[PDB]
Structures are given as C-alpha cells and as structure tokens.
C-alpha cells in the first residue's frame, strides 16, 4: 500500500525529466507506469468504482474516439498505419487508472517540473551554443518539443502556495519556458503560452478576481494597439505583412504562407460541406486535394501537403461529423472533468487540488490553441505526451477532490 504510493510519487517526480531529457524517456515512463500496474494486482478493481465520476467519462471519450477512427478505416480501405498515432491515446486511461489506484504526492510534481525545465534549458543551450544546430530540440521533433515546453511551463506556473518564495519559483517556470522556446524558434508556441497564461493568473494568485482579469486583458489590448500606432514598431511590421497577405489572397495571387494555408482550409471545408457525415476517411487528406478543381488547373504547394494544418478543419474534412465531435471531445471532456474537480476542491478548500485543476485546464487550453494552427495527431511524441499528462493530472486531481 505504502510502497505503491512511494514508487508512484517518485515516478511523478521523474516524469518530466524522463520525457524531455532522457532520449527514450517516453518508453521508460511507459514501463514505469506499467510495472506499477503489475503491483496493483489485488487492487485496481476497487479503484475504478469510487472514482467512476472521473474515470468513466475519460474511458468513454477515448473508446468512442477509437471506435470512430476504426469505423472510418473499415469503410474506407486504408493502411493500418494511419491509426497508430490515435492508438497512443489509450495510455491516458492506463495513466489515470494507475494514478487513482496508487495515490501519489502532488508536492513532488512541481519540483520535478522545475528540475526538468532547468535541465532541458541546459541541454538546449549546449545543443545551440556549442553544437551549432538550427532548431535545438533535445532528442525529438521541434514542434513536439515546443508543445511539451509550453505545457510543462504552464503546469509549473500553477504552484500551490502563497509564500513569497513560491511566486518567484513559478514566474521562473515561465521565464525558463520562454527562453527554451525562443532558443528553438517556433514563436507560435511562445505566443500561445503567453496568451493562455493570462487566465492562469487567477489560479496563480488567490486574490486575483475576474474584474482584475478583464482590466488586465483590456490593458494588454491597449498595449497591443499602441504598437500598431508606432510606424517603425516591429509589431506593425509583422501585422501589416499578414494584412497584405490577406488582401493578396482576396484575389488570384494565392502563392504565399498565409494564402497557401487559407486555400487548403477552403478546399477542406468545401468538401466537408459536400460530405457531412463521412469524408474521405481517417487521414487521406491528399485525396481531397488531388480530386479538387484548383489542383487540376494550378500547380502550387497547396496540392502536395499530406494533411491540413488545423486540427478542427482536418478532422472535419477527413473523418466527418462524428469524427469532429469525438476529436473535440478528446479535448473538451478533460476540460469538463477538470472544472468539476476544481469546483469541488475550491468548495473544500484544499489549494493543491484547485491548483492541479487549474493546471489541467491551462494545459487543455494551450493544446487547443496549438491545434488551431497544427494537427496534434500527426506527431506521435506529442500525442503520447498529451495522453500521459492528461491522464496523470486527471487522476491526481480526482484523488485530491474526492478524498
């Protein structure tokens, strides 16, 4: 009983370091969560029942998503390799179930987060300033690494505590995250993290109400508008570019970064309108482009992209209305569960549970914002990291709220 808790708090402490710093750390963490499950031999049947207000919605959402993706492959004969990445979201079920069976200590998650962030900063600094690398990602893809950095920085920003030494240990998390993100480019992750950290400022300060948030976002908007009124400001330099890009797209000159991605979106949405219920199927987005009228009369980069670069548009065009609903569910059901746990924790006091729920909600929001400009299911590392993090956070939050 006690060893199950100790070997689980050690695992939650080591999870960020394994995921980021260790090369094959995802497999190591999977083996760790699977060997903890082999010691829950006598339990794990009396763990699901009392935590069925949190475990069952997650299991139902994951099973429905898997069934929809399998049914969008049975009807449209596709190679089985298109569902390997979706097959990795089943690990959220296992992670949450293991966590709820063996109660961890959430106080060791935050120290693990900050240690992982610091060590990843050191690794990226070495991989950029000495072994010159264009985009210094530790051992994985740049996009997946950036998403992991953003998610873990948000998690670390939700430090449970009020002492002066805790706020300066949570702002350091954002500082390390933004340094790591700027080291490997991918400014979109920086923008997403900075945007989604503003709602987190209510979790961060248990004095910061909603009016103080409305005025804060008003001040941010005023600062953003002030930049556009300075003629030489770089913000006006990267905003006028997008404005001119939109204007060029509104006539025939669609051969640009904004224009190319606003043209695959239109082709995807026009096909989704044609076939609402069943699209081409899971994956197979290239069929929409190759059967389109624009590609048959124009030679451009928009006809070579394997998949769309927006999660909602890609899901709607490829796997239809049921697939769109289940894809939105994979990100909305955890949000509802986190809100339900946060409300109970706040009604009970217990600042650790409230901070955990806030961190989960921020992770969900950041994942949605990232999916606004990319497909999360494309990268296996991103999928497995998201599944594991959501499972662990949901399990710990449910354990804190229920008891």
């Amino acid at each position, epitope marked *: 009983n006690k060893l199950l808790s100790r070997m689980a708090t050690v695992l939650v402490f080591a999870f960020p370091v394994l995921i980021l710093c260790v090369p094959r750390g995802a497999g190591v963490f999977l083996a760790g969560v699977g060997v903890l499950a082999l010691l829950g031999w006598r339990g794990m049947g009396r763990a699901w029942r009392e935590y069925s207000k949190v475990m069952t919605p997650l299991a139902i959402a994951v099973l429905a998503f898997m069934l929809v993706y399998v049914g969008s492959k049975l009807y449209f004969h596709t190679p089985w390799n298109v569902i390997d990445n979706p097959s990795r979201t089943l690990l959220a079920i296992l992670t949450c179930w293991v966590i709820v069976r063996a109660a961890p200590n959430p106080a060791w998650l935050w120290r693990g987060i900050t240690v992982g962030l610091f060590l990843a900063l050191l690794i990226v600094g070495y991989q950029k300033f000495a*072994l*010159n*690398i*264009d*985009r210094p990602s530790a051992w994985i*893809q*740049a*996009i997946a690494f950036a998403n992991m950095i953003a998610a873990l920085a948000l998690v670390g920003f939700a430090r449970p505590g009020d002492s002066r030494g805790t706020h300066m240990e949570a702002w350091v998390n954002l500082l390390l995250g933004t340094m790591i993100l700027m080291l490997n*480019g991918t400014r979109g992750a920086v923008v997403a993290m900075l945007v989604t950290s503003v709602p987190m400022l209510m979790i961060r300060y248990r004095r910061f109400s909603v009016r103080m948030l409305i005025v804060a976002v008003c001040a941010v908007a005023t600062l953003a508008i002030g930049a556009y009124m300075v003629p030489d400001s*770089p913000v006006s*330099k*990267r905003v006028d*570019d997008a404005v*001119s890009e939109i204007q060029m797209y509104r006539q025939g000159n669609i*051969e*640009t*970064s904004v224009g*190319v*991605r606003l043209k695959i979106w239109h082709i995807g949405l026009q096909y989704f309108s044609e076939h609402p219920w069943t699209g081409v199927g899971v994956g197979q987005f290239a069929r929409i482009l190759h059967a389109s009228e624009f590609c048959h009369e124009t*030679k*451009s*980069l928009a*006809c*070579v*992209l*394997e998949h769309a*670069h927006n999660d909602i548009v890609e899901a709607a065009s490829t796997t239809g209305i049921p697939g769109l609903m289940v894809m939105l569910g994979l990100f909305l059901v955890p949000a509802v569960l986190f809100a339900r746990a946060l409300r109970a924790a706040r009604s009970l006091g217990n600042p650790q549970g409230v901070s955990l729920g806030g961190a989960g909600l921020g992770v969900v929001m950041a994942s949605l914002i990232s999916g606004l*400009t*990319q497909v999360t299911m494309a990268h296996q590392a991103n999928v497995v990291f998201y599944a594991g993090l959501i499972g662990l956070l949901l399990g710990m939050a449910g354990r804190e709220a229920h008891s």
Partner: antibody
Amino acid sequence: VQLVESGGGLVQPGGSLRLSCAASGFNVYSSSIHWVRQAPGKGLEWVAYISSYYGSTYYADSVKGRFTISADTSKNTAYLQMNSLRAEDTAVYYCARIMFKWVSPNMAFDYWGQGTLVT
Amino acid sequence: DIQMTQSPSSLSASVGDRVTITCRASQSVSSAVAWYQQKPGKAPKLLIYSASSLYSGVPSRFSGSRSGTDFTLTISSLQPEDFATYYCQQSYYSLVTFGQGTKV
C-alpha cells in the same frame, strides 16, 4: 515570386564587391535569404544566410570575417558584401529562399535566383 | 562542420531502369535532408524536402527515404529529362552542407 541578382564582374584579388539580390512576390524580412555559390565545374557551396526576423547571421568557414550579409526591408533586397577577394572565390553565386516554416520545420530552398558570375 | 559523401559520384543508366542515390552523413542529422536537381547552366530545383516529402511540380517517380543516418533518393523510371546532377543538404546544423554531387 521572383529572385533576381546582379553585381558580378571582374574583381582582382584583394578587392571588394557587393552582390544585390532583388526580390519580388514576397517580403524579405518575413522569410530568409541564403547565398549559395558554385565553383566552375564543381559542386554547390553554401556561404551565408540571415534569419527570418531577428537578423542573426551565420557564415561558412572559408568566408567568415570577410563576407557581410545584410537585408533592406525598405527596398526588399538582400546584399552580400564581399571583401578581401582571392582567386579561390571565383564561382557563380545564387540566392535562395527557404520554404514556409510550418510546411518544413528545417530550411530548404524552394525558389532560387538566376545566378551571377564573379571572377 | 558536417560532412556528406554521395555514392556513386557519377552513374550512367538507360531509360526505364530505376536508379538509387545514397547520401551519407558524418554526424546525426535527424530529418533535415533535402534533394535538388541541377541541369547544366541553370539554377537547381528542389525535389524532396525533409527526406520523404516531394515538392510542387515534381513527378511521383521521385521518392526518398531515411534509414538512420543513411539518406537515399530513388527514381522509379528515368525519363529523358531525368539526366542531371543531384545534391543532398543538411539543415539540422546551423551551417548547412551540400553533398559532393552525383551525376546521371
């Protein structure tokens, strides 16, 4: 989208010459410009480039300290200032523009220039 | 820097027989390998980016693959306009490097 460069000619060793790479159909300060040279009857060789927005510059081993790459958003042109020329720098110099960052995370040249000959 | 070797340095094959080009790498370049085709006296044109994705206006005959640090381009069949030199590049390191350049 078009990249046009001019400025090649006869330069005695120890001289200086500037190559201007005028661009059209896109914005230079948004993307990045890479310079690639090819010696007569030999393979392609990279020399320098600039970053998208920050303007950070990197140079090859042979040309560092003597080549000064720069950009001018007002005229939407990219320049490579060549200094302390030697007989080993005779090549045809091409421009290059990387693909969209979201399409390819790493740099890959998609539109090139017509190339200029420097002796 | 990072050094690549291409083999063969120059090959000769008739039309219809598939050819494969091997590009090596001194150090570990993950996926930042691009392939170009240069015809005599003209600017090179991009063929494959990220070692497995074709570019616009490139026939489906061209295809690339990765096996660890062994990057290989293959052509399903040679049409009369497929006779040109090919190069392989790394973009993982900040100082990019082109291959020696095979010839068909």
